[PDB]
Design a protein around this ligand. Structure first.
Ligand code: VX8
Ligand code: ATP
Ligand code: ATP
Ligand code: CLR
Ligand code: CLR
Ligand code: CLR
Ligand code: D12
Ligand code: D10
Ligand code: D10
Ligand code: MG
Ligand code: MG
Length: 1173
């Protein structure tokens, strides 16, 4: 990155934002290359702000009894806040004395006003000076206030993450990914810009006090008639704001709930596709959206009135304030016009700048209070010893997973556990499923605090878990995991873990960029990477929680005999295992039985025992009808105003005194009141908001439908953070910020067009005067948008790394805290923060450049017309000055319409991003016997890549068992997915004579019942997790839970089959999820069954359930079983072996095993006697 141009600049350059020119002149011609983003200023780096706010917050916590976050931000930003507020106020007081000069200038066009024609040439100079000094005080102050919100947000987002890395394990079940994502997302671009409105809590009352004193000179005691109406309207607006904030509190939790459901299934898209579960997931998402949209509609109906208050307040204020004075005393047109000029500023101060400031304070303090409440949660306790002889000792330990039951003393997870091991000894833990072997490791690690007992060790540990975690990056980064790279140790760890066979088959071959999750790999490869990472680290104690689950017999034997028994034989290690062979060469054995130690000792003792607006409008056919309605009313209003004006000049005492040389005020008065005459009442503003909110519902439905049916090659290129970004932030934009911004843009545009047309009909010169300013405005807008759109696209793309890092850091909390790598991930998070900050700051600077340039154009044009008007006014009736000055009263509203157009264009980027996902590509009795025939099948994952499987041909027969097998990483899962055409494939398969291309895909996928390798469990009840379609009553559901063995597990929770599972089934063990998958497969009665390693981690006792199910529930079913364990191959009639990317088939298993001496040598004696009796 090249340096920031704001580091070396000039004062005269910092005042006008000239340093932003070099990029603006370039992004206009070509695209914006990478080499053109500047490095952030050193003051805007996450480290400095993070440490500064952290020091202040820690001092606040330590000293005071009642700590508060606002007291800590006050000691960092208050003096700059108050420094910029004063210049903002000085800029705002200019707008109120402007009439005191412009009115005298305008009144000199009447030859019967001789007093003010003397001093015109000095009023003009004063007006030019006032316009010059407003534009220099307003915009730099606003930019300085914008630059402080970014710093505050960056400083608080670091504290949130640093606290997240310390939460207790008993609090993680109350905070989801959705809550943190919502917290970050709703404050990511609005908290920055909210500081430019906070000072109007005290700026606006002063303006009211000044303006009422100025008006009091015109209408002596009648001004309070107009003031009281504004006070009542402000009471009404306060009530509207209070009632608006109620509908948003009821809606946040529903969005939080929807986000986790949306994120769960997209990261499990393959299981959803295999189950054919799209129609149920979409229905759940729709039911969630149904109520949230109702709350959003109710909030928008109130925000409409809040925004509409400003336009309808003009006529009433002016008429009400002028009527009594005019009734007790006649009035001149000059007084009326001056009153309009003052009331225009008064209404802006009262109805648009105060309530927005109040709502800004409400929202900001609401965010800060939630941030503080998060920072005051319960922390993980690390208080333990840090040095000893590393003699692991544990005594009298009992722990409860439920906090209440452990506080009262709910059944104990552990009961009276005690053991001791020396330096270098190996303890083997064994037991049934659900016995509590992983929870013992959690007790040792400190994740589960025991109620009674002690654990004593040093504090240096290495960890390997039952579910493997893969962080984004390459393999080498996943293994070295934040430390120095030692070549020899890396080589020996790679060789010991049997990874060189699979690594040599990769293309980049060591630097494969893995995604967040590792779905580019297989099960055993991820398991071996997770084991190698633990082996690499140096520590006194090594905990290994069933690493051999997904490995075959030969690979497991090699790893155990050359990585645990020869590489780290001089280190203390605790291994959770099941095989009777591993217990032979352990030093101490612990066996658990539902909580209690059934046996502790040795083995010698056990044997003794742009087409985007156009596409957006045409999404819904009712929007066009509403727009045509809004146009037909507007044209009638214009035609009525035209005839009421035309009937004044053609007709001839009364209260209002009007003459011939001062009748030109009739237009000046009209232009100031047309805001009320062309405003949108509730017959036009409520239908518009309603029909614009319906478009978001339609677009969300289309987006979700189109994502769920894309091919897997398209879906793998996506990331978790990008999906989460697009489904949270852009959708919230489309539901909240688009309707009312569009409404304001349309309102202002109609006002400008009506004001121009009505007058240009009666005087065909004011249009001619206005043209050259309109052309300049349009040219500058078109010049700026070319770069603005690119910068906005980059900023919108820059929010994905933050969410990706948040997700990956929440999924791997235990490994991070066990290894001690928190500073590493804090450094990783700071980089993503800086990367977003650069683009956001650049866009924010160029916007202010545009704003000040448009202001300068307006000011120079007005200065040009002022002197011409003053000079050309001869000895009476300054006709030249009557036209240009009125043109400049319509250009002032066009200036506001331009900025409204700018922010509408900035909000359409979300619409374009949403439309990009809708345009993804699309992947698109009979089952009597189940006979299958495969011919010339060839499978490959990516187009133009190596073929995992090449020219496979075999046949099966109805009602026959087939055993599929091979080495780890051979293509068993690839074959079982090529049956369902989940990837790119050629050749054919026919089932009972019916081929692929004869039928549709969704019908071909209903001939199969599948058990996958990765268990998918979403948030919901047990019953819903068993059937989302709700096809079976509780009779059959309980009858099947009786058979798969889930009665005692399900009855353990308070709502029997009504209990709600959170965090993806964290309440269950590893075997209970396998049993739920088996139940799912049993419930749907199919003919052809594809079982991908069903009994992964099950002990020998619980595999009996699987084999009884395969014996009784599947009788007339063609089964294909991909099993790594040797005993399951005793029921199969055919065998398929995958090797060298091709399949060889066998009838008997003896023929299979006699030809593989090494593989045949790896079989345990218990499983050896049965194969060869
Ligand atoms: C007495 C007082 C003085 C200054 C401030 N603010 C600030 O210094 C800053 C700030 C913070 C939040 C904001 C904001 C500006 O503008 C916003 F975007 F609108 O939100 C510059 C940091 N705050 C208070 C205050 C308010 C409310 C309660 C308490 C309390 O002590 O209980 C104290
Ligand atoms: N967060 C939790 N809340 C409540 N109960 C839990 C929680 N985690 C686990 N349990 C329960 O505690 C028991 C022990 O679970 P654990 O996973 O340690 O068994 P296990 O011996 O590891 O079985 P497996 O070898 O099949 O994983 C289980 O019966 C489980 O239902
Ligand atoms: N999504 C993917 N994209 C690219 N390559 C993949 C993808 N999934 C798997 N592979 C590669 O294709 C090969 C086949 O993997 P497969 O899952 O069939 O192995 P496996 O036989 O199931 O091994 P295990 O028994 O460990 O599960 C592997 O070497 C793997 O690296
Ligand atoms: C800095 C802010 C608060 C402005 C100060 C507010 C008060 C004190 C000021 C603002 C405008 C002032 C008024 C402006 C004009 C006149 C007309 C004159 O014939 C009598 C005094 C009177 C009525 C002034 C009284 C004081 C006044 C009301
Ligand atoms: C009515 C118009 C003119 C606005 C002027 C009144 C303003 C200042 C009033 C109206 C409602 C008021 C709020 C009503 C309730 C509470 C809750 C209390 O725990 C703190 C004060 C607080 C937050 C008040 C602050 C002041 C407040 C916002
Ligand atoms: C002179 C008069 C008109 C000034 C009025 C100042 C008002 C608008 C200010 C002063 C104190 C402020 C409040 C301070 C505390 C809270 C509690 C928080 O949960 C919501 C914001 C809220 C409710 C603020 C809203 C704005 C507030 C009420
Ligand atoms: C909203 C507060 C208004 C304060 C200014 C009133 C001015 C009254 C002047 C009386 C002169 C006799
Ligand atoms: C055939 C497309 C019609 C588009 C007209 C929409 C109304 C435009 C004026 C706001
Ligand atoms: C190009 C704009 C000309 C405006 C001057 C109007 C002439 C008025 C003649 C009485
Ligand atoms: Mg376990
Ligand atoms: Mg597999």
């Amino acid at each position: 990155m090249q340096r920031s141009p704001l580091e070396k600049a000039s004062v005269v350059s910092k005042l006008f934002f000239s340093w932003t020119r070099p990029i603006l002149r370039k992004g206009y011609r070509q695209r914006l290359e990478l080499s053109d983003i500047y490095q952030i200023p050193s003051v805007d780096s996450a480290d400095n702000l993070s440490e500064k706010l952290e020091r202040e917050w820690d001092r606040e916590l330590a000293s005071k009894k009642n700590p508060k976050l606002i007291n800590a931000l006050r000691r960092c930003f208050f003096w700059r806040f108050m420094f910029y507020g004063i210049f903002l106020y000085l800029g705002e007081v200019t707008k109120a004395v402007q009439p005191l000069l412009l009115g005298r200038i305008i009144a000199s066009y009447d030859p019967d006003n001789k007093e003010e024609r003397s001093i015109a040439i000095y009023l003009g100079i004063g007006l030019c000076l006032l316009f010059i000094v407003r534009t220099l005080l307003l915009h730099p102050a606003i930019f300085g206030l914008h630059h402080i919100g970014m710093q505050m947000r960056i400083a608080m987002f670091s504290l949130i993450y640093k606290k997240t890395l310390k939460l207790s394990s008993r609090v993680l079940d109350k905070i989801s990914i959705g809550q943190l994502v919502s917290l970050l997302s709703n404050n990511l671009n609005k908290f920055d810009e909210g500081l430019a409105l906070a000072h109007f809590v005290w700026i606006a009352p002063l303006q009211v006090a000044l303006l009422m004193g100025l008006i009091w000179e015109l209408l002596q005691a009648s001004a309070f008639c107009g003031l009281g109406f504004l006070i009542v309207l402000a009471l009404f607006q306060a009530g509207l704001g209070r009632m608006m904030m109620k509908y948003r509190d009821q809606r946040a939790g529903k969005i939080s709930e929807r986000l986790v459901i949306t994120s769960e299934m997209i990261e499990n898209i393959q299981s959803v596709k295999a189950y054919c579960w799209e129609e149920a997931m979409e229905k759940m998402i729709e039911n969630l959206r149904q109520t949230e949209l109702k709350l959003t509609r109710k909030a928008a109906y109130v925000r409409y009135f809040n925004s509409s208050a400003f336009f309808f307040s003009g006529f009433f204020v002016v008429f009400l304030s002028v009527l009594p004075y005019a009734l007790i005393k006649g009035i001149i047109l000059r007084k009326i016009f001056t009153t309009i000029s003052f009331c225009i500023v008064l209404r802006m101060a009262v109805t648009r700048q105060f309530p927005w400031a109040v709502q800004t304070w409400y929202d900001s303090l609401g965010a800060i209070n939630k941030i503080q409440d998060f920072l005051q949660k319960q922390e993980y306790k690390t208080l333990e010893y840090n040095l000893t002889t590393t003699e692991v000792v544990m005594e009298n330990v009992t722990a409860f997973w439920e906090e209440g039951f452990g506080e009262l003393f709910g059944t104990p997870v552990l009961k009276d556990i005690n053991f001791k091991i020396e330096r270098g000894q190996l303890l083997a833990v064994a037991g049934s499923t659900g016995a509590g072997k992983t929870s013992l490791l959690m007790v040792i690690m400190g994740e589960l605090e025991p109620s009674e007992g002690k654990i004593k060790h040093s504090g240096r540990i290495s960890f390997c878990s039952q579910f493997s975690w893969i962080m984004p990056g390459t393999i080498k980064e996943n293994i070295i995991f934040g430390v120095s790279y030692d070549e020899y140790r890396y080589r020996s760890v790679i060789k010991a873990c049997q990874l060189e066979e699979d690594i040599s088959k990769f293309a980049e071959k060591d630097n494969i960029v893995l995604g967040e999750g590792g779905i580019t790999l297989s099960g055993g490869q991820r398991a071996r990477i997770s084991l190698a990472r633990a082996v690499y680290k140096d520590a006194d104690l090594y905990l290994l929680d069933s690493p051999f689950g997904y490995l075959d017999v030969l690979t497991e034997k090699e790893i155990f005999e050359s990585c645990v028994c020869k590489l780290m034989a001089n280190k203390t290690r605790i291994l959770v295992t099941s095989k009777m062979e591993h217990l032979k060469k352990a030093d101490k054995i612990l066996i658990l039985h539902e909580g209690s130690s059934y046996f502790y000792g040795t083995f010698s003792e056990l044997q003794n025992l742009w087409n985007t607006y156009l596409r957006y409008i045409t999404v819904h056919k009712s929007l066009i009808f509403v727009l045509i309605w809004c146009l037909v009313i507007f044209l009638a209003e214009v035609a009525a105003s035209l005839v009421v004006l035309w009937l004044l000049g053609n007709t001839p005492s009364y209260a209002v005194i009007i003459t011939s040389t001062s009748s030109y005020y009739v237009f000046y008065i009209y232009v100031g009141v047309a805001d009320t005459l062309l405003a949108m009442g509730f017959f036009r503003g409520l239908p518009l908001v309603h029909t614009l909110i319906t478009v978001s519902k339609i677009l969300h439905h289309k987006m979700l439908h189109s994502v769920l049916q894309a091919p897997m090659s398209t879906l793998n290129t996506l990331k978790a953070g990008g999906i989460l970004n697009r489904f949270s932030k852009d959708i919230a934009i489309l539901d909240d910020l688009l309707p009312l911004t569009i409404f304001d843009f349309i309102q202002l545009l109609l006002i400008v067009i009506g004001a121009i047309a009505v007058v240009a009909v009666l005087q065909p010169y004011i249009f001619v005067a206005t043209v050259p300013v309109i052309v300049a405005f349009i040219m500058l807008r078109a010049y700026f948008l070319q770069t603005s759109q690119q910068l906005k696209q980059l900023e919108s793309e820059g929010r994905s790394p933050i969410f990706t890092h948040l997700v990956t850091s929440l999924k791997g909390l235990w490994t991070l805290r066990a290894f001690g790598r928190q500073p590493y991930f804090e450094t990783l998070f700071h980089k993503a923060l800086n990367l977003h900050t650069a683009n956001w700051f650049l866009y924010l600077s160029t916007l202010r450049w545009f704003q000040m340039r448009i202001e300068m154009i307006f000011v120079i044009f007005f200065i040009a017309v002022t002197f011409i008007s003053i000079l050309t006014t001869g000895e009476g009736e300054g006709r030249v000055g009557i036209i240009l000055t009125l043109a400049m009263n319509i250009m002032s509203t066009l200036q506001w319409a331009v900025n409204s157009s700018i922010d509408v264009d900035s909000l359409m980027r979300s619409v374009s991003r949403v439309f990009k996902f809708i345009d993804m590509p699309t992947e698109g009795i009979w089952p009597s016997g189940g006979q299958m025939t495969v011919k010339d099948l060839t499978a490959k994952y990516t187009e133009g890549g190596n073929a995992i499987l090449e020219n496979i041909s075999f046949s099966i027969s109805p009602g026959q068992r087939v055993g599929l097998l091979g080495r780890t990483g051979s293509g068993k899962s690839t074959l079982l997915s090529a049956f369902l055409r989940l990837l790119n494939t050629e050749g054919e398969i026919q089932i009972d004579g019916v081929s692929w291309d004869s039928i549709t895909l969704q019908q071909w996928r209903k001939a199969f019942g599948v058990i996958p390798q990765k268990v998918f469990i979403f948030s919901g009840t047990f019953r819903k997790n068993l059937d989302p379609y709700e096809q079976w009553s509780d009779q059959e559901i309980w009858k099947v839970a009786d058979e798969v063995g889930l009665r005692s597990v399900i009855e353990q929770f308070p709502g029997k089959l009504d209990f709600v599972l959170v965090d993806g089934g964290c309440v269950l063990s590893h075997g209970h999820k396998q049993l739920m998958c088996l139940a799912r497969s049993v419930l749907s009665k199919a003919k052809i069954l594809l079982l991908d390693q069903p009994s992964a981690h099950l002990d020998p006792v619980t595999y009996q359930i699987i084999r009884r199910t395969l014996k009784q529930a599947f009788a007339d079913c063609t089964v294909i079983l991909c099993e790594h364990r040797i005993e399951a191959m005793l029921e199969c009639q055919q065998f398929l072996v995958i090797e060298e990317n091709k399949v060889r088939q066998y009838d008997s298993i003896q023929k299979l095993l006699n030809e593989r001496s090494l593989f045949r040598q790896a079989i345990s004696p218990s499983d050896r006697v049965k194969l060869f009796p």
